[PDB]
Symmetry: D2
């Protein structure tokens, strides 16, 4: 019947962004959560997708989304500090593939995603 | 270097929510967009994921995310009205599978996603 | 330690192959099965992938695989007659997306897959 | 109109199978190929899926397939020696996630897949 907006990156720190390697941290807040008080499925995905986009930028490329996949491994909670790590695992002539993982402050794996993108150009 | 928060469902209309069938509409606004002025990949995913969650609720179930997939077909733009349609395509004893599609106001297909969930219970 | 080769399409009937629409039937035999006597995960995928390839051919296109996804819904068994139905759900300038479903002789849904392909040309 | 059966593991060597780690090699032969003389999409998937199944066995578990994904990176060719490497990247109470990669004899990455399985038991 009613639910609040889901928001992502109301806070973040770019730790690394260089040559296809990206690390970004963010703290889980109330707008990150679903009904059950866990990190929203869309929120966690958006975290990964954005970092994927940064990997692409870091390569001097312009990209457009094609297909994306995600596995949910462990719930995120309010006040968790999530470390988002992106890597380009395949750079093709016309496509790129990015792998992105999220771990919490205890080192536990939260989710893992893969992004298949089309290279719009340089 | 810098980017704004990505937000989803700052506005929405639930048109249908009954027995595994869900339709929700929303208007694309500035917080929905990426750098290039298109609907953000995470935004479109979050739209689908939330409606998937509603399909599950509409069945009287509690669900937890496992794996999710999305295909991006056509860009969303500022002021687009996006119609989000969810259906449970498989209700298993212990898992559910939801298909979710988004179409714009011109009837064009924007994206399509599939959600594989674990049934936490009734 | 030891396992037999997995084989697909040692028998098949093309029922329909026209303008992006494909239906193919096949009977599950011993070489289709895994250790537990169910239709092998790779076998069911191969069934879908091949029919996806036929959808592409039926459109007068040449395609190359990019990314593919599958959901397993119900086990296939020896002597099942599996109906494999393929459709192009999106024909883009440079990519295609195919949806493929398998149902058994009792009308039950066995698996469902999605193929994202690159158009090599006409 | 006509096409030959697609077959997988008509030859193979298990190099490693221990505690969630699996390496298997196989040589690409004529029955592995599609129309265009490349390794068939279903063939490469079947290679990965089978090794995923071995990872699960190596853990003393019984598994059933749920959802699987694959990215195709570079074509396989006749006489290629493909090295298939599987790992369990997440062992949950009720599910497992396997990552599987294939590289050819030149060290080039051919494809990469992810398997989400349900643990039937011990």
């Amino acid at each position: 019947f009613h639910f609040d907006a889901i928001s992502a990156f109301e806070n973040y720190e770019i730790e690394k962004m260089r040559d296809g390697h990206v690390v970004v941290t963010t703290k889980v807040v109330n707008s990150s959560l679903n009904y059950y008080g866990n990190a929203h499925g869309g929120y966690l995905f958006t975290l990964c997708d954005q970092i994927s986009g940064l990997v692409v930028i870091s390569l001097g490329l312009d990209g457009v989304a094609l297909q994306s996949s995600i596995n949910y491994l462990k719930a995120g909670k309010l006040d968790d500090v999530l470390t988002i790590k992106g890597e380009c695992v395949h750079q093709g002539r016309t496509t790129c593939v990015m792998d992105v993982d999220i771990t919490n402050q205890e080192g536990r794996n939260v989710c893992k995603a893969t992004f298949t993108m089309f290279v719009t150009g340089q």
